[PDB]
Design a protein around this ligand. Sequence first.
Ligand SMILES: COc1cc2c(cc1OC)CN(CCc1ccc(NC(=O)c3cc(OC)c(OC)cc3NC(=O)c3cnc4ccccc4c3)cc1)CC2
Ligand SMILES: CCCCCCCCCCCC(=O)OC[C@H](COP(=O)(O)OCC[N+](C)(C)C)OC(=O)CCCCCCCCCCC
Ligand SMILES: CCCCCCCCCCCC(=O)OC[C@H](COP(=O)(O)OCC[N+](C)(C)C)OC(=O)CCCCCCCCCCC
Ligand SMILES: Nc1ncnc2c1ncn2[C@@H]1O[C@H](COP(=O)(O)OP(=O)(O)OP(=O)(O)O)[C@@H](O)[C@H]1O
Ligand SMILES: Nc1ncnc2c1ncn2[C@@H]1O[C@H](COP(=O)(O)OP(=O)(O)OP(=O)(O)O)[C@@H](O)[C@H]1O
Ligand SMILES: CC(C)CCC[C@@H](C)[C@H]1CC[C@H]2[C@@H]3CC=C4C[C@@H](O)CC[C@]4(C)[C@H]3CC[C@]12C
Ligand SMILES: CC(C)CCC[C@@H](C)[C@H]1CC[C@H]2[C@@H]3CC=C4C[C@@H](O)CC[C@]4(C)[C@H]3CC[C@]12C
Ligand SMILES: CC(C)CCC[C@@H](C)[C@H]1CC[C@H]2[C@@H]3CC=C4C[C@@H](O)CC[C@]4(C)[C@H]3CC[C@]12C
Ligand SMILES: CC(C)CCC[C@@H](C)[C@H]1CC[C@H]2[C@@H]3CC=C4C[C@@H](O)CC[C@]4(C)[C@H]3CC[C@]12C
Lengths: 571, 571
Amino acid sequence: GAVLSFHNICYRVKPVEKEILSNINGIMKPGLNAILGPTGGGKSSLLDVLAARKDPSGLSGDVLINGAPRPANFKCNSGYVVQDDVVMGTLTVRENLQFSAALRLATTMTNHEKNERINRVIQELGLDKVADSKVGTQFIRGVSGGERKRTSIGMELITDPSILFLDEPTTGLDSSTANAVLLLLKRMSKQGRTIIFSIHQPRYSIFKLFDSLTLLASGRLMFHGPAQEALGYFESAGYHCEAYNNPADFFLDIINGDSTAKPLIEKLAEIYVNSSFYKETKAELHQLSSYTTSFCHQLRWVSKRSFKNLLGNPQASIAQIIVTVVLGLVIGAIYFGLKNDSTGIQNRAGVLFFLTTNQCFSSVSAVELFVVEKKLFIHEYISGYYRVSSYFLGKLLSDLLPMRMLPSIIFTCIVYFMLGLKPKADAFFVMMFTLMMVAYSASSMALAIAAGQSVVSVATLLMTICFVFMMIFSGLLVNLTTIASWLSWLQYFSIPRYGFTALQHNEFLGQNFCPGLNPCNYATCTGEEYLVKQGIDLSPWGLWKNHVALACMIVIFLTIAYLKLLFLKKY
Amino acid sequence: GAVLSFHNICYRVKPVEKEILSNINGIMKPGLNAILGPTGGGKSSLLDVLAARKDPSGLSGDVLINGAPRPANFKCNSGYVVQDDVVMGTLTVRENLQFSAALRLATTMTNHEKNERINRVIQELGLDKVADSKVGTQFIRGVSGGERKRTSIGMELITDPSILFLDEPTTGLDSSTANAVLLLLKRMSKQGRTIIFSIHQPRYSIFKLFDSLTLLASGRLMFHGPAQEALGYFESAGYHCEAYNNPADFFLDIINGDSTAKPLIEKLAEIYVNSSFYKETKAELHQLSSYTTSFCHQLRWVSKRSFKNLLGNPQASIAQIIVTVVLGLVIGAIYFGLKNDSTGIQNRAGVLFFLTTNQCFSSVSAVELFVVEKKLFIHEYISGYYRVSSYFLGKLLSDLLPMRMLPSIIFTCIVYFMLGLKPKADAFFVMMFTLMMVAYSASSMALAIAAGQSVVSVATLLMTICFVFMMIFSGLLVNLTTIASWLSWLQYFSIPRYGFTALQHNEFLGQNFCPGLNPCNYATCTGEEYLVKQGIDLSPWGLWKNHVALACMIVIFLTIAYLKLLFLKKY
Ligand SMILES: COc1cc2c(cc1OC)CN(CCc1ccc(NC(=O)c3cc(OC)c(OC)cc3NC(=O)c3cnc4ccccc4c3)cc1)CC2
Ligand SMILES: CCCCCCCCCCCC(=O)OC[C@H](COP(=O)(O)OCC[N+](C)(C)C)OC(=O)CCCCCCCCCCC
Ligand SMILES: CCCCCCCCCCCC(=O)OC[C@H](COP(=O)(O)OCC[N+](C)(C)C)OC(=O)CCCCCCCCCCC
Ligand SMILES: Nc1ncnc2c1ncn2[C@@H]1O[C@H](COP(=O)(O)OP(=O)(O)OP(=O)(O)O)[C@@H](O)[C@H]1O
Ligand SMILES: Nc1ncnc2c1ncn2[C@@H]1O[C@H](COP(=O)(O)OP(=O)(O)OP(=O)(O)O)[C@@H](O)[C@H]1O
Ligand SMILES: CC(C)CCC[C@@H](C)[C@H]1CC[C@H]2[C@@H]3CC=C4C[C@@H](O)CC[C@]4(C)[C@H]3CC[C@]12C
Ligand SMILES: CC(C)CCC[C@@H](C)[C@H]1CC[C@H]2[C@@H]3CC=C4C[C@@H](O)CC[C@]4(C)[C@H]3CC[C@]12C
Ligand SMILES: CC(C)CCC[C@@H](C)[C@H]1CC[C@H]2[C@@H]3CC=C4C[C@@H](O)CC[C@]4(C)[C@H]3CC[C@]12C
Ligand SMILES: CC(C)CCC[C@@H](C)[C@H]1CC[C@H]2[C@@H]3CC=C4C[C@@H](O)CC[C@]4(C)[C@H]3CC[C@]12C
């Protein structure tokens, strides 16, 4: 079995540094161990310290498994269940468990075997009725909080861990369900596994199951030792129960100073260090003194989950495609029959500008989903599911690449022929390629800004402002040849400028807009004159210059996003 | 005291109609009464039925207070505490209680007296340490879930009600805090008040406090009667406890079929109807067979809370003002020194278009706050705080009117003189007025769309799409004189068109853009020619036509919003 231990633990958090956890010493031998305490005592913090999910800076003690230091496979042979559930709402119960099994259990096992394990877990936790139902989504009403909580427990159990950490496994659950969960852990603990969990308001039947007990309060350790002997320890100092049927209440009332015999917290702790229990553990403590699956598998499974999540959030995929089609048709109707007249220049420039800005501003919606999933990404990376690289490339090849390509194609196919733009194939494909490139560049910039930011509103605001400032330098609202020199350099940071310039160069090159024709100066009859007055070049190199600039921006921004994820605080 | 009662209650929910609650009969005499049951049994639904927060369509029974039917002041002399807390995060604890006191307690009392009551409540609930701290916000980490829960309890207690309904008052609270809350209610119930609440996992000490008991399960009523006699009733059918220290577990285990003696639910219910308890209540039941404060006060307090909420969410007020200033300065730099040259027309039209669209699209951010507060509005209206009209006008005079006016002023003051637009005062004030009008019209349209919609994403998408379609008809991207007749009529539904046309008419009227000057046809030297080619009229009536159209749209859209709130399902 696994014999966890700790000694002289203290933790500090920040300027001013405060100690959430003061001196703590204990041994969590195999079996079933518990951590009772009042709210704010530090139950969740100690658990993370034991499971190495806290920044090692603050930690000021030694944690040992079976005497030897922490192995590098610790997170490959342990499980952690979070106080606040992190479960992808858009998926069903079974799908989430499948995801955990696939990326944590080794690939040597057959997929049928894994599904058999998954079914067994579901039956044990009583999730059969909602096995294939969806977890809650904003659009889709889903399972209750209790079923969601048990689902998080399931994902960790599937790994068949030798060590399991749980935080408030029984919250939002009625007594019957709570008892079933605890009995399962007890059965799971009579085989050599070590189970550590924090609980609120146990029943007497449950409390008898506890083998080892830990009692936190305001950081201090009031009592650690066998659960059955806890009553005797308190009785010696005073506090003869003889009132409460449930002992768990008897402990908490003492801590809150509601029972008969400087602060009561410090006073009680001083008693423990003088107890035999502290002496025994000090004697024992002093005496004692990688990823399962490869890159490709992680990529496939992450991309799959992203596909499903995207389809489950309609506003970002289905709605964008539908509005794309509607806009294409309306534009085709509004600009139908472009004429080489006085009005041709205006309408052509306007439509191209509209398409460009539409591609740029549509990227905001997708990345917002990248923002909301920061918490899940951190939790899964810490738990040891996947690497950063796999998550990044999967989200790209599932969300950014497929969906952002289509709007360009739809817009070109619908608009080009209805309006009557350049009737040559080269122009058609150039238009499609250019729109694709601006879309990808905007998405990459959005990712660079949004990656690592927790709040959706702030990221949305920042990206919107940046796109606005780009749009001012697109080449239509202002003439770039009239801008002062000390500000003109900014026009090279604008994506819409490159796309818009390319489209203009493609459309205006061989057109005359004065129908019947002593040249009339101050008049732009020919398209080339308009291009010149707007600053654009006439060589073939201008178009391709814009395109290569877009590609370089894509690469730069995506790389920045990867680095922002890499140097993030995953603790 | 207050003697509530019910008889033959059944409720139906929807097509297919299902009965959440089957036959239910009971009397909730003064004192302390409880509703235990497993999750999903129907505890929250019955409570709403008793407190008249459910649609009366489904209800199929009679509810009586003191024998007489439900008075119209029922919600003026009752309190309801929600299972999921509804507390404005951006405010402190004390501020929320002040809001409840001001609008529910009569104005005859002095404000100092109310604050004295508020202090007493806080001391009783143990919220003194966090009395003036802020409740949780996304930006501001706030009080724990337990303190938030007790705060919701406080707001109802301040009214000093003769009848109080609570739903899971002890959830997220440790035993010590839970016991304190229950003891307070017990003390509050020995004076004539009637208290009804639903609870999970009581302690034996608490359960002895219960005077009357109700036991729901899968809709059916398994037991109603005195709490002390509940054990005897079950013992007669079998189920001699002699195992469990806490009786509350003994009841729930039976319902879940985990104890010794068609489904167990139906089987148990059949026993109750044959019990003496059912006979007694049937004998008794068969035997038995406005706003405190005026309009202005509600308006003032709603507007005040809205001010605070707006300031607490920086992204909507502070950020919008800052970006407004930054955009003004950047625009002033980009377009500095507008010249009566070939480029003057383009830059002028572009800047005016940018300002107009900025005013239109900035309205999305504010209304989103109107969306998120739908739940709170429904809860408060049902509880009897305020009317619909007061809420509407308060949110207007607090959020829409003050904040949307400033950006226009800032933009005009910064931009007008730096660029060098028409150097006459009339044009300056016309520009300011026009921008104000488009801002208000867009906000009104946003409210009309967003009011009554629960999801933020959908409303944001809809308003954004509508503004896009308006923007196509602004007069720049397309020439309105070239649009086909069967679609041209749409141009009269566009707000940016009216604002943009007014600004163009103000700026271009007396300008010549050909510097040195056989007239050169196909050339727009004079501004009037440009206006004509864009379809605009030259009379003074065009400008004012646009303005009056905006005003009419404002009135229409705001009225629609009020009606949408009025005919909403507040149940
Ligand atoms: C988790 O819950 C959620 C929370 C939230 C959201 C979604 C959620 O759920 C996931 C999304 N919330 C977005 C709120 C929002 C959206 C937009 C703006 N503001 C502009 O967009 C704009 C501003 C200008 O000045 C400030 C401006 O100046 C000129 C031109 C602007 N836009 C254009 O010009 C333009 C042009 N073509 C377009 C074509 C297609 C689509 C958009 C186009 C836009 C401001 C706020 C924020 C919170
Ligand atoms: C002027 C009109 C045309 C030019 C428009 C300029 C847009 C520039 C877009 C590329 C910048 C970029 O993408 O920056 C990318 C950076 C990269 O993160 P980081 O630097 O490593 O931050 C450190 C992060 N750590 C500490 C975790 C490592 O993200 C950010 O900084 C986030 C905020 C960006 C705000 C940008 C607002 C720009 C307003 C400009 C007002 C004049
Ligand atoms: C074409 C370019 C220029 C013209 C642009 C047209 C914009 C019209 C704006 C005013 C309409 C309005 O504000 O409608 C206001 C209505 C009012 O609610 P209700 O009718 O009572 O719904 C019943 C609600 N109950 C049942 C509770 C009473 O809100 C809505 O319907 C909500 C959805 C509106 C979607 C509008 C999308 C428009 C897309 C047009 C694609 C051609
Ligand atoms: N990163 C952090 N920054 C600042 N304070 C923290 C941080 N982490 C924990 N704390 C503080 O430590 C104290 C204990 O928080 P903790 O998360 O341990 O609560 P808990 O013991 O899990 O109780 P419960 O989860 O039941 O509320 C709190 O006062 C909290 O503010
Ligand atoms: N509007 C509704 N539409 C469909 N079903 C409903 C509706 N309201 C309630 N129900 C159903 O009634 C049953 C009881 O739900 P209820 O809200 O009463 O739970 P509860 O008794 O409050 O239990 P808890 O709140 O502890 O989960 C549930 O199965 C729920 O799906
Ligand atoms: C039908 C046409 C004319 C409507 C104009 C386009 C806009 C207003 C429509 C087109 C497609 C629509 C979306 C279609 C599907 C969904 C998924 C649903 O679960 C919520 C609403 C939502 C997100 C719709 C919102 C409104 C929407 C974006
Ligand atoms: C991290 C971010 C800010 C990186 C920004 C890099 C951008 C500004 C770089 C990437 C590639 C660059 C372009 C590469 C090629 C050319 C062609 C040349 O004849 C003019 C400059 C121009 C058009 C460059 C302008 C600056 C440019 C677009
Ligand atoms: C300083 C200038 C150049 C920045 C450009 C303007 C944008 C990027 C800045 C200007 C004002 C800024 C806001 C100022 C204050 C707040 C409140 C804070 O609790 C969260 C960030 C937030 C919401 C900022 C977000 C970024 C913001 C909107
Ligand atoms: C509920 C919503 C859709 C109501 C929409 C009403 C709009 C379209 C109405 C309100 C006031 C109306 C305007 C009132 C006055 C004039 C001046 C006239 O010489 C031309 C029509 C014009 C410009 C009207 C166009 C239509 C108009 C703008």
